[PDB]
Amino acid sequence: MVLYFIGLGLYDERDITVKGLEIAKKCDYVFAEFYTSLMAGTTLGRIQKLIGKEIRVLSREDVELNFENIVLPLAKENDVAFLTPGDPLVATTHAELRIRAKRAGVESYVIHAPSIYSAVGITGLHIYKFGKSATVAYPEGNWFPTSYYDVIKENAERGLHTLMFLDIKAEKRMYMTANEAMELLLKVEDMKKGGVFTDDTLVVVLARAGSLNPTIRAGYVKDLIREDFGDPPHILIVPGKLHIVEAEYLVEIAGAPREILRVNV
Amino acid sequence: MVLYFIGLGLYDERDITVKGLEIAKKCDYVFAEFYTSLMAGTTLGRIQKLIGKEIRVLSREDVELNFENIVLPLAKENDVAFLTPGDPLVATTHAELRIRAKRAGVESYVIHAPSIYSAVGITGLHIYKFGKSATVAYPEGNWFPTSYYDVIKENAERGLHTLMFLDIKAEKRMYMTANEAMELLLKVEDMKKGGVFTDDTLVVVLARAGSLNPTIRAGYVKDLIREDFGDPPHILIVPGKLHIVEAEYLVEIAGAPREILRVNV
Ligand SMILES: Nc1ncnc2c1ncn2[C@@H]1O[C@H](CSCC[C@H](N)C(=O)O)[C@@H](O)[C@H]1O
């Protein structure tokens, strides 16, 4: 009679919380999805071994179209868990799944875990200074979406930082690198000429947040655009005006050029 | 030889990640602070028992003025851990502490935990739609903070949601309630009269996130300003222009007046 939305955390099988692990171990059925994101520092097998339960993986369609026919029925007479990378309900359409549960007479509870939304705090950029967030999508055919460029513009204009999620093809396991995101943004700049993203723009790249050895790099596009940030996923941040303390952290921890102490503060 | 920045989570000791617990269990010395937030469902003893270590609790002064005199010296010969509520670097000033560690020749690592910043997802509000965040601070003497009011205005103008962290005076065991935040905001409105926060403003209250039964309420100020939301900690959220599904969730899950289902696009 109960559905548990449990977050898996950031990177590996140890990123789930003690609460989430203990609750999962007591559920009769355990489902999971890796279409919104993947756990790059681990495998389904390692997650399964840790929880000690077989984990039925669900596709985006299984969830979006048939959550009520695959997951909820079992929740009527058993304890069911639905695992997702990061923190549950962060992915835009997941909150609605709780409404579906209610409509089915199923009680649901949320077990939180670290999310990239809070984990970026490791970049040294103040959390309150982040503005609207965006996702960089690949242009395709006759479609060249550029809204993510306008997000940066509106944020930076108000001295706010912009968190950018990079395109991902979960099933194809194809990632967009921070390098590719930068090239795309430079191409968007050439079209819009807004003076929003150029070779002189300061950016921060966060890779493998959650790992004990994440990659945190900060610098100007012209120097970072061809740098190797390692294995994904990559997160790109275009920070607005910098607090002197933010800049000092970026210099001392993220190897940023001391130039930002005078140029971006 | 190393220093560990380990977050403890939202509500109780089980909100720590498995990674955090295993590492904390093996540290030689364990320090912590409980002034940046409130973990309403646990006690120092319960945490000590889980980790199996004695925990030396530090005050704001011990940390801000003496971190490098109390904690760092031990990290030069042992593995030290510094625990904090929620995520260690979120809406705190602990990030700067990594610079202090570096300057003292001490390597530091960060272990994330669920944070209130991402837990807002449980309100049904799309997390990418949140704008600049703010903090409602208790007035003191003749000083009456009001910057948080302008944050709302700026976000609302952009159709973005506003997350408001609430004040805490841990040494006095004072935790600002969503009710007190609403009272303060109405007073600022009387002063500025910008039509930013009034009796007709829709707000969302999230209390004790991380517990199994957090209080999640949505409604007009006039109706919620005196509602009992349970024990602290609380956060107040002033949503912008709602998506249809956001409104549906607020009504179905947060008990908002069904009339907000009708969005003025
Ligand atoms: N579990 C919780 N439920 C509701 N509000 C919370 C909360 N935890 C923190 N808050 C809010 O956040 C404020 C502290 S700011 C520190 C946040 C912490 N570092 C984190 O990552 O979560 C509290 O005063 C309250 O306003």
Ligand code: NA
């Ligand atoms: Na945000």
